[PDB]
Amino acid sequence: VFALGNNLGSTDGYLATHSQIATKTSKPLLETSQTVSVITREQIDDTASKTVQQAMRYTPGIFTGQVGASNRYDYVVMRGFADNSVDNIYLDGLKAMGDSGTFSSMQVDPYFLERIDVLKGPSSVLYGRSLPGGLVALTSKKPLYEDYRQITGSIGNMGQKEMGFDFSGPLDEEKRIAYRLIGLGKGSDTQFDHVKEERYAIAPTLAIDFSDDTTLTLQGYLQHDPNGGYHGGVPADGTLSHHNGRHISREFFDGEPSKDDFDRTQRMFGYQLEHRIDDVWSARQNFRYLDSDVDLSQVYAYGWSASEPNKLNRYFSGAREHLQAYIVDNMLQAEFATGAARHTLLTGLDYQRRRTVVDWRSGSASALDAFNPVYGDDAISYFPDDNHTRRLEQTGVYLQDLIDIDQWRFSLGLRQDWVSVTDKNRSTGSKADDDWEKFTGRIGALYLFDNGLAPYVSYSESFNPNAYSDASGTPLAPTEGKQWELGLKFQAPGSNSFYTASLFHITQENVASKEPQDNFYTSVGEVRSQGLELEAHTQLSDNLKLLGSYTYTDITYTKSLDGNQGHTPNQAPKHMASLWADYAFDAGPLSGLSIGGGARYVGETWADKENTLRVPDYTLVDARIGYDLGKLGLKGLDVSLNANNLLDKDYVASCYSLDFCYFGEKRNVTATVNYQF
Ligand SMILES: O=C1CCC(=O)N(O)CCCCCNC(=O)CCC(=O)N(O)CCCCCN1
Ligand SMILES: O=C1CCC(=O)N(O)CCCCCNC(=O)CCC(=O)N(O)CCCCCN1
Ligand SMILES: O=C1CCC(=O)N(O)CCCCCNC(=O)CCC(=O)N(O)CCCCCN1
Ligand SMILES: [Fe+3]
């Protein structure tokens, strides 16, 4: 059993029935007064999904183009909140613990994942520090109690190759002890000249039942990315328009092949202890330690040379980083009745402690011709080194009551947080030391009709430490999100279909803002995001699987000192939609064959905060072919072929500014072989 900290749903095709993302305790999606999406293991594979970021490319309210084709980090823009989008990821109930103010942001390979859960809007009441768009919860693969052995191989264009294996099963005659061990190797060239991606990772897991009342799960995850692909951008001039009559290629490398390194070693171990006391009382401890090394050498373009017609000015960034982080979550849940009301009452205490030691170097590099470049002129003019030790501590105390009474489903949550953040400029010897406490709350109400219709309303709050500091060097007040949400959910009790609509209004406060004149920030900015999401998961037969989505997002700087009080953030499409279908032939000559694909639409986005032109809209097509050769008498063998961006469209996915625009991925074609023993 054991609802606390577990999804416990069911899954069929692309549709999950339950999640714990919104509650830290298993709850049907239909009875949860929040917007929750679930991306199934099957959805990841069918779409040939290569990262967490890309796996959401079919999910409403999520923009997946912040840095275009780059795969170095998972940038998850939620409900138009692009800033700190790298810090939205949770793994097995615990904040991932990257430091978004450094290069040490972690990435979880999808091959280790069983599910991806997406919670929209402010959600600090259960998690502490987080962004106003929502958050993403990855659920790792766990030991199975029956033997499972899979081997997979993939090959593609762009020099892609990959190997994985996934073995699981019980170790004891009684099936109280089970393991899973997963490993993988991969490599890629990318559309971009002279770039490599490469990764090696292994994940051991051990599960032990001390009895029916107690389970301990032991986890390891060790990952080495000796190369980091491409993580650059080029000027809008001449990507979005011609530059002296020519266009920059989508394969252009703005760096120096002799000085382009990204080495990230991420080492994690942890455990989850599950103890049932009573049919009433349950307790859980989730724990994870992280230790990572990141090494970076990057020459990048930054604007056009003022003197040399078709050359870009270039600069150099260098970094060596060591990140350490501890996270524990202590949960105690009471399940009990009080007359007609059934209560699910949760109390928790969590603790985050992080230290990041960063030695940064920078300088000026030679200009580079943006059309027919000559590489090799790699001398750097160094700027002053900039060395820091960064520390963060977060202690949270939270309370939640899920109250079900007749057809009502209510949610009440409160959390008090103590945050301490410090930054020792180790070059200068100075230290910024700041302590804060924040109170956050959430209240939800949903009415469940007996046909599977569920209207609901939600109010929810969030906070995040401010990345900026004021006229005295003291960091500003944490930013704050507040959200009103209205929704409607529908599942016909027969069907394997599910439909939702969500209407949202998010206000974000204490955003840093200053007049262009000034060098100092004040916490007087405000941002508002409002809109509508529609999501459809259908099975119209036991062969035909559907997904669809529509997103309308109106985000605006409602208060700014910098001239921008009235503008729309860049990297924030007003309109998005997507649709994916998969058809499996199940009897007859074609049996064992599967066919699939889909299309996703992103509306225009602004290239800059100043709003001076648009990044055009784009429509991409995906397609798939699978064949289970077991149907030809070799059981456990299946093969598939995938193509994303099937029409090979050449587009800018987005721009962070007028200097930095990113290309979308060209067609990515994959062939996969899966064999179970
Ligand atoms: O370590 C760093 C920041 C991290 C970074 O920049 N990465 O690229 C790594 C990925 C983490 C976040 C994704 N990027 C952003 O959120 C854009 C940040 C931005 O606007 N800047 O100007 C840069 C910040 C100035 C200091 C530069 N040094
Ligand atoms: O140069 C720095 C510090 C180094 C750094 O932060 N790097 O990422 C490495 C080099 C950036 C190259 C372009 N990177 C992108 O366009 C992705 C977004 C991003 O990462 N930014 O930092 C946005 C601003 C980058 C310019 C200002 N800051
Ligand atoms: O304002 C700051 C700190 C805030 C920050 O880092 N932002 O990104 C603010 C978001 C608006 C700017 C969008 N992007 C760019 O201008 C490109 C690279 C970048 O991001 N820079 O900051 C380098 C610009 C120098 C600005 C001075 N430093
Ligand atoms: Fe950067």
XYZ file of C-alpha atoms in Angstrom, residues 67-552:
486
model
C 17.738 27.987 -25.315
C 16.474 26.072 -28.337
C 18.295 22.896 -29.365
C 20.677 22.975 -26.352
C 20.550 19.825 -24.172
C 22.944 20.889 -21.399
C 20.310 21.960 -18.875
C 16.595 21.392 -18.426
C 14.899 24.766 -18.908
C 11.246 24.458 -17.983
C 9.313 27.669 -18.519
C 5.961 27.293 -16.714
C 3.023 29.590 -17.338
C 5.509 32.086 -18.839
C 7.923 32.324 -15.880
C 11.272 31.823 -17.621
C 13.553 33.226 -14.936
C 15.123 30.481 -12.762
C 13.504 27.869 -15.047
C 16.505 25.578 -14.371
C 15.499 25.196 -10.690
C 11.977 23.780 -11.228
C 12.954 20.089 -11.008
C 12.296 17.729 -8.074
C 13.403 14.098 -7.949
C 11.699 11.449 -5.813
C 10.052 14.151 -3.692
C 13.195 16.221 -3.079
C 14.437 19.474 -4.630
C 17.191 18.622 -7.114
C 19.690 20.988 -5.368
C 21.477 22.528 -8.329
C 22.597 26.127 -7.791
C 20.943 28.221 -10.527
C 23.338 31.082 -9.794
C 26.241 28.940 -11.052
C 26.954 26.399 -13.763
C 26.203 23.538 -11.325
C 22.674 22.673 -12.351
C 22.023 18.920 -12.469
C 20.262 16.938 -15.168
C 18.396 13.634 -14.751
C 18.523 11.291 -17.725
C 15.002 10.137 -18.742
C 16.105 6.501 -19.010
C 16.140 6.331 -15.203
C 12.615 7.666 -15.004
C 9.268 5.988 -14.547
C 7.181 9.147 -14.652
C 7.220 12.920 -14.925
C 4.670 14.867 -12.925
C 3.961 18.539 -13.529
C 2.297 20.814 -10.964
C 1.211 24.224 -12.233
C 1.446 27.459 -10.287
C 2.794 28.475 -6.895
C 3.403 25.413 -4.737
C 5.729 26.377 -1.849
C 3.242 25.207 0.811
C 4.623 21.669 0.488
C 8.087 22.252 -1.004
C 9.412 25.625 0.218
C 11.421 27.751 -2.192
C 10.039 27.511 -5.742
C 8.891 29.506 -8.771
C 5.440 30.921 -9.573
C 4.983 28.801 -12.706
C 4.908 25.513 -10.843
C 7.344 22.624 -10.591
C 8.265 19.280 -12.129
C 8.539 16.028 -10.188
C 10.544 13.170 -11.664
C 9.802 9.711 -10.282
C 12.674 7.275 -10.484
C 12.482 3.658 -11.474
C 12.303 1.362 -8.412
C 13.087 -2.326 -7.819
C 10.523 -4.724 -9.248
C 9.450 -7.897 -7.428
C 9.434 -9.954 -10.594
C 12.429 -10.508 -12.826
C 12.893 -7.866 -15.510
C 15.823 -7.487 -17.879
C 15.903 -5.100 -20.794
C 18.645 -4.159 -23.231
C 18.248 -1.283 -25.665
C 20.349 0.212 -28.358
C 19.749 3.304 -30.419
C 21.362 4.962 -33.410
C 20.523 8.175 -35.204
C 21.672 11.055 -37.345
C 24.079 13.630 -35.867
C 26.362 10.778 -34.785
C 23.915 9.650 -32.097
C 24.541 6.278 -30.378
C 23.227 4.997 -27.016
C 23.363 1.890 -24.922
C 21.290 1.080 -21.884
C 20.301 -1.916 -19.843
C 17.740 -2.112 -17.117
C 17.753 -5.129 -14.796
C 15.465 -5.649 -11.823
C 14.042 -8.444 -9.734
C 13.829 -9.989 -6.293
C 16.882 -11.255 -4.418
C 15.070 -13.272 -1.774
C 12.930 -16.368 -1.987
C 10.243 -14.531 -0.029
C 10.382 -11.471 -2.396
C 10.984 -9.012 0.495
C 14.307 -7.817 -1.002
C 14.546 -6.504 -4.556
C 17.102 -4.631 -6.659
C 17.202 -2.515 -9.779
C 20.400 -1.597 -11.597
C 20.365 0.697 -14.622
C 23.280 1.850 -16.752
C 23.612 3.813 -19.949
C 26.191 5.274 -22.349
C 25.491 7.849 -25.006
C 27.144 10.289 -27.350
C 26.113 12.782 -29.962
C 27.346 15.330 -32.435
C 24.748 17.897 -32.684
C 23.583 20.106 -35.484
C 26.398 22.361 -34.412
C 29.895 22.036 -35.849
C 32.700 20.613 -33.623
C 30.418 19.770 -30.659
C 30.066 16.500 -28.755
C 27.656 15.198 -26.184
C 28.594 12.125 -24.184
C 27.175 10.573 -21.024
C 27.762 7.507 -18.844
C 25.533 6.783 -15.870
C 24.624 3.977 -13.482
C 21.826 3.779 -10.909
C 21.723 1.028 -8.273
C 18.628 0.735 -6.105
C 17.840 -1.696 -3.263
C 14.450 -2.232 -1.609
C 13.983 -4.023 1.716
C 10.797 -4.891 3.573
C 11.665 -5.314 7.261
C 8.088 -6.444 7.497
C 4.749 -5.564 5.909
C 4.896 -2.329 7.937
C 8.385 -0.999 7.077
C 10.234 -0.524 3.768
C 13.719 0.938 3.257
C 14.799 1.912 -0.281
C 18.490 2.624 -0.954
C 19.443 4.686 -4.013
C 22.539 5.586 -5.981
C 22.906 7.651 -9.121
C 26.340 8.352 -10.601
C 26.597 10.305 -13.863
C 29.528 11.572 -15.936
C 28.986 14.011 -18.798
C 32.536 14.408 -20.165
C 31.124 16.659 -22.923
C 28.286 19.117 -22.681
C 27.009 19.686 -26.198
C 26.263 23.219 -27.300
C 25.039 25.935 -24.946
C 25.401 29.132 -26.959
C 23.386 31.696 -28.845
C 23.982 34.176 -31.603
C 22.603 37.668 -32.371
C 19.065 38.122 -33.595
C 20.484 40.499 -36.233
C 20.879 37.992 -39.054
C 19.050 34.935 -37.636
C 15.588 36.607 -37.596
C 16.532 38.974 -40.491
C 19.349 39.083 -43.016
C 22.739 40.496 -41.923
C 24.509 42.209 -44.801
C 22.342 39.984 -46.998
C 23.151 36.610 -45.415
C 21.835 34.204 -42.729
C 23.783 32.419 -39.975
C 23.736 28.632 -40.255
C 21.921 26.434 -37.718
C 25.150 24.402 -37.481
C 27.353 27.383 -36.622
C 29.693 27.050 -33.637
C 30.521 30.406 -31.997
C 33.319 28.978 -29.843
C 36.852 27.682 -30.313
C 37.275 23.927 -30.880
C 40.552 24.041 -28.980
C 38.838 25.684 -25.959
C 35.265 24.342 -25.622
C 34.825 22.037 -22.612
C 31.976 21.119 -20.285
C 32.690 18.381 -17.732
C 29.987 17.646 -15.167
C 30.268 14.749 -12.748
C 27.194 14.358 -10.572
C 27.213 11.834 -7.698
C 24.036 11.166 -5.713
C 23.041 8.636 -3.060
C 19.997 8.564 -0.795
C 17.193 6.574 0.740
C 13.492 6.583 1.465
C 12.249 4.961 4.669
C 8.559 4.082 4.776
C 6.914 3.041 8.053
C 3.230 2.245 8.609
C 2.393 2.606 12.343
C -1.414 2.076 12.144
C -4.201 2.066 9.657
C -4.250 5.698 10.803
C -0.590 6.721 11.238
C 2.216 6.597 8.673
C 5.691 8.141 8.559
C 8.284 8.625 5.839
C 11.837 9.956 5.527
C 13.247 10.864 2.116
C 16.936 11.636 2.045
C 19.445 12.553 -0.679
C 23.088 13.693 -0.750
C 24.610 15.244 -3.868
C 28.219 15.958 -4.853
C 29.074 17.397 -8.253
C 31.980 18.768 -10.228
C 31.516 21.087 -13.191
C 34.345 22.314 -15.422
C 33.610 24.814 -18.179
C 35.629 26.451 -20.932
C 33.477 28.373 -23.369
C 34.230 31.005 -25.986
C 30.909 32.544 -27.016
C 29.633 35.204 -29.352
C 28.316 38.391 -27.780
C 27.225 40.951 -30.360
C 28.695 42.101 -33.674
C 32.166 43.554 -34.035
C 31.837 47.309 -34.438
C 34.886 47.292 -36.733
C 34.835 43.953 -38.600
C 31.851 43.559 -40.898
C 30.935 39.861 -40.631
C 32.731 38.927 -37.421
C 31.199 38.572 -33.992
C 32.811 39.936 -30.911
C 33.592 37.045 -28.639
C 34.294 36.552 -24.980
C 35.408 33.726 -22.749
C 33.849 32.228 -19.653
C 35.636 29.682 -17.497
C 34.606 27.865 -14.366
C 35.598 25.089 -11.988
C 32.801 24.296 -9.514
C 32.280 21.821 -6.677
C 28.706 21.609 -5.375
C 27.678 19.855 -2.166
C 24.075 19.480 -1.057
C 22.053 17.618 1.564
C 18.236 17.319 1.602
C 16.000 15.388 4.016
C 12.205 15.353 4.322
C 10.435 14.077 7.462
C 6.718 13.354 7.032
C 4.056 12.154 9.468
C 0.504 11.492 8.227
C -2.733 10.764 10.135
C -5.659 9.166 8.244
C -8.904 9.096 10.297
C -12.628 9.922 10.316
C -14.532 12.546 12.349
C -18.193 11.858 11.732
C -18.979 12.417 8.071
C -15.549 13.932 7.402
C -12.592 11.740 6.447
C -9.235 13.493 7.187
C -5.808 12.957 5.642
C -3.599 15.091 7.899
C 0.102 15.561 7.062
C 2.826 17.286 9.103
C 6.362 17.610 7.825
C 9.827 18.977 8.489
C 12.394 19.296 5.689
C 15.935 20.648 5.583
C 18.167 21.800 2.755
C 21.832 22.697 3.122
C 23.923 23.587 0.090
C 27.487 24.734 -0.518
C 28.915 25.661 -3.915
C 32.591 26.546 -4.357
C 33.065 28.360 -7.655
C 36.229 29.730 -9.211
C 35.255 31.805 -12.268
C 37.534 33.189 -14.972
C 36.622 35.435 -17.889
C 38.170 37.386 -20.712
C 38.016 38.700 -24.251
C 38.532 36.428 -27.240
C 39.127 37.089 -30.902
C 36.307 38.038 -33.185
C 34.896 35.255 -35.308
C 33.474 35.415 -38.785
C 29.819 34.479 -38.581
C 29.862 33.124 -42.173
C 32.881 30.858 -43.197
C 34.672 31.026 -39.901
C 38.319 30.198 -39.246
C 38.898 28.510 -35.895
C 42.133 28.367 -33.994
C 42.776 31.925 -32.818
C 42.169 31.001 -29.182
C 44.259 33.491 -27.184
C 42.284 34.937 -24.262
C 42.737 38.371 -22.698
C 41.829 37.566 -19.100
C 39.674 39.761 -16.839
C 39.972 39.615 -13.029
C 39.159 36.222 -11.519
C 35.925 36.014 -9.503
C 35.870 33.334 -6.778
C 32.938 32.598 -4.445
C 31.682 30.163 -1.831
C 27.882 30.095 -1.899
C 25.745 28.656 0.906
C 21.992 28.172 1.314
C 19.961 26.671 4.151
C 16.226 26.133 4.167
C 14.264 24.700 7.074
C 10.567 24.114 6.459
C 7.697 23.147 8.739
C 4.453 22.364 6.946
C 0.929 21.146 7.656
C -1.748 19.869 5.283
C -5.275 18.544 5.766
C -7.088 16.862 2.888
C -10.726 16.756 4.058
C -13.243 14.635 2.141
C -16.902 15.024 3.171
C -19.767 13.730 0.981
C -18.839 14.759 -2.546
C -16.526 17.535 -1.310
C -12.751 17.348 -1.466
C -10.929 20.094 0.459
C -7.254 20.979 0.754
C -5.658 23.143 3.462
C -1.958 23.775 3.802
C 0.388 26.016 5.745
C 4.164 26.190 5.845
C 6.625 28.341 7.780
C 10.159 28.569 6.260
C 13.528 29.775 7.551
C 16.030 30.552 4.768
C 19.674 31.630 5.102
C 21.790 32.473 2.062
C 25.424 33.492 2.098
C 27.983 34.452 -0.545
C 31.642 34.906 0.428
C 33.507 36.748 -2.321
C 36.595 34.821 -1.770
C 38.668 37.078 -4.099
C 37.653 40.214 -2.128
C 37.091 38.501 1.269
C 33.640 40.015 1.750
C 30.569 38.010 2.750
C 26.914 38.673 2.164
C 24.939 36.948 4.946
C 21.126 37.124 4.914
C 18.412 35.408 6.999
C 14.661 35.262 6.219
C 11.470 33.518 7.358
C 8.429 33.189 5.167
C 4.909 32.000 5.691
C 3.000 30.421 2.793
C -0.526 29.017 2.529
C -2.799 27.090 0.169
C -6.545 26.365 0.152
C -8.454 24.182 -2.326
C -12.071 23.119 -2.810
C -13.458 20.619 -5.345
C -16.899 19.013 -5.765
C -16.948 15.494 -7.297
C -20.149 14.690 -9.230
C -21.008 11.027 -9.703
C -20.403 11.155 -13.476
C -16.727 12.014 -13.042
C -17.103 15.793 -13.405
C -15.136 17.862 -10.897
C -15.217 21.663 -10.786
C -12.726 23.201 -8.390
C -11.130 26.418 -7.120
C -7.654 26.919 -5.619
C -5.628 29.668 -3.919
C -1.876 29.055 -3.643
C 1.334 30.899 -2.724
C 5.079 30.604 -3.369
C 8.378 32.323 -2.569
C 11.965 32.300 -3.917
C 15.137 34.069 -2.679
C 15.816 37.176 -4.747
C 18.768 36.795 -7.132
C 19.487 40.553 -6.844
C 20.860 42.999 -4.282
C 19.997 46.624 -3.523
C 21.772 49.991 -3.096
C 23.638 48.530 -0.077
C 24.632 45.111 -1.470
C 22.028 43.361 0.676
C 19.901 40.953 -1.392
C 16.332 42.075 -1.930
C 13.318 40.478 -0.318
C 12.387 37.068 -1.741
C 9.980 37.262 -4.653
C 6.443 36.070 -4.011
C 3.815 34.357 -6.126
C 0.086 34.288 -5.395
C -2.426 32.438 -7.569
C -6.147 32.099 -8.041
C -7.098 29.016 -10.060
C -10.397 27.740 -11.459
C -10.633 24.412 -13.211
C -12.842 21.617 -14.440
C -11.917 17.972 -14.703
C -13.719 15.111 -16.417
C -13.347 11.351 -16.570
C -16.183 9.130 -17.709
C -15.997 6.194 -15.237
C -15.991 3.797 -18.204
C -13.460 5.509 -20.267
C -9.748 5.680 -20.375
C -10.159 9.342 -21.193
C -9.482 12.461 -19.193
C -10.079 16.144 -19.843
C -9.197 19.271 -17.961
C -9.442 23.005 -18.303
C -7.630 25.376 -16.008
C -7.988 29.121 -15.688
C -5.227 30.925 -13.814
C -4.200 34.348 -12.483
C -0.662 34.566 -11.031
C 0.790 37.722 -9.415
C 4.533 37.836 -8.637
C 5.801 40.394 -6.115
C 9.092 41.937 -4.983
C 10.630 41.507 -8.418
C 13.857 43.452 -8.727
C 13.562 46.589 -10.805
C 15.637 49.747 -11.394
C 15.754 52.710 -13.753
C 18.246 52.263 -16.706
C 20.291 55.113 -15.223
C 20.833 53.299 -11.962
C 23.149 50.499 -10.803
C 21.108 49.570 -7.681
C 17.886 47.480 -7.573
C 14.673 47.931 -5.616
C 12.005 45.253 -5.009
C 9.170 47.187 -6.605
C 8.668 45.149 -9.785
C 5.611 43.026 -10.359
C 4.664 40.451 -13.015
C 1.213 39.041 -13.783
C 0.464 35.847 -15.722
C -3.058 34.793 -16.561
C -4.574 32.381 -19.029
C -6.193 29.075 -19.856
C -4.998 25.502 -20.340
C -6.902 22.604 -21.945
C -5.566 19.048 -21.912
C -7.039 15.884 -23.439
C -5.978 12.257 -23.024
C -8.094 9.829 -25.023
C -8.358 6.145 -25.849
C -10.984 5.709 -28.558
C -10.067 2.017 -28.874
C -7.457 -0.340 -27.430
C -5.270 0.548 -30.413
C -5.551 4.268 -30.749
C -3.987 6.590 -28.147
C -4.465 10.390 -28.175
C -3.021 13.485 -26.455
C -3.928 17.123 -27.026
C -3.293 20.477 -25.463
C -4.070 24.176 -25.815
C -2.423 26.965 -23.870
C -3.305 30.651 -23.676
